[PDB]
Amino acid sequence: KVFGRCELAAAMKRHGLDNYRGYSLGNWVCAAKFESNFNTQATNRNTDGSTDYGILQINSRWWCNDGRTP
Amino acid sequence: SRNLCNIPCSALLSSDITASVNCAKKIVSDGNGMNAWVAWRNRCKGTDVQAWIRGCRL
Numbered sequence: 001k002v003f004g005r006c007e008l009a010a011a012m013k014r015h016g017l018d019n020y021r022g023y024s025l026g027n028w029v030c031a032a033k034f035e036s037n038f039n040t041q042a043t044n045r046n047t048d049g050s051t052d053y054g055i056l057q058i059n060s061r062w063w064c065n066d067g068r069t070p
Numbered sequence: 071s072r073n074l075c076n077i078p079c080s081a082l083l084s085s086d087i088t089a090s091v092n093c094a095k096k097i098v099s100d101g102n103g104m105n106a107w108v109a110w111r112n113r114c115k116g117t118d119v120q121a122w123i124r125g126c127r128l
Contacts (some may be wrong), residue, residue, distance in 0.1 A: 001085035006126035008087075013128055015091040021098050025128070026119035027110065028094075033122065034109035040090075041083050054082035054090045056107065062072040063093055064079035069071040 003038040003055070005029065032056055 003011070009029050012018065018025035035057040036042035044052045050061040050069045060069040075093035082090045097106050104110045 005122065009123045009126050009128060011087055012091065015088065017091060017094070018128075020095060021103065023098065023104055024119065026122040027104060027114055029122040030114035030117070030119050031104065031107050031110040034113045035107060040085055040087065043083070051079065053079045055087055056082075056090050056094050057109075058075070058079075058082055058090065058093050058097065060071065060079050063075045063097065064077050064082055065071065065073040066079040 001040045003032075003040070005033075005038070008032055008038055008055070 009025060012028050013025055017028045032038055032055050036055045038055065040055045042054065042057065044057065046052065046059070048061065050059050051066055052059050053064060053066070058064055060066045075096055077089060077093065082093065098104055100106065104115070
């Protein structure tokens, strides 16, 4: 799913990201924008063999299991 | 390979961002904050980020 700018903002605020750890909502929407272009299906492989996943491009080296990262 | 968020990566591709949000909350609390996201640090940090929610009904 490719979110709309304001749509994602609403979704993130609802999930408690606004001001989470001192980071205002705009930071998260900006991050999602340039990391995945608001596309939840975005994937990107890195040279170390890990892959980044989702709207926020979370890395497989230490955050999630994809069954192919050392 | 560590699985600190305890979830299959495929779960982070869902149209429901609950999984991604919960894991991101763990990442940002880790220590380097949002600097953990390369694009944020190079394209968001130090800019008028309020602009990204302007015109929205929050």
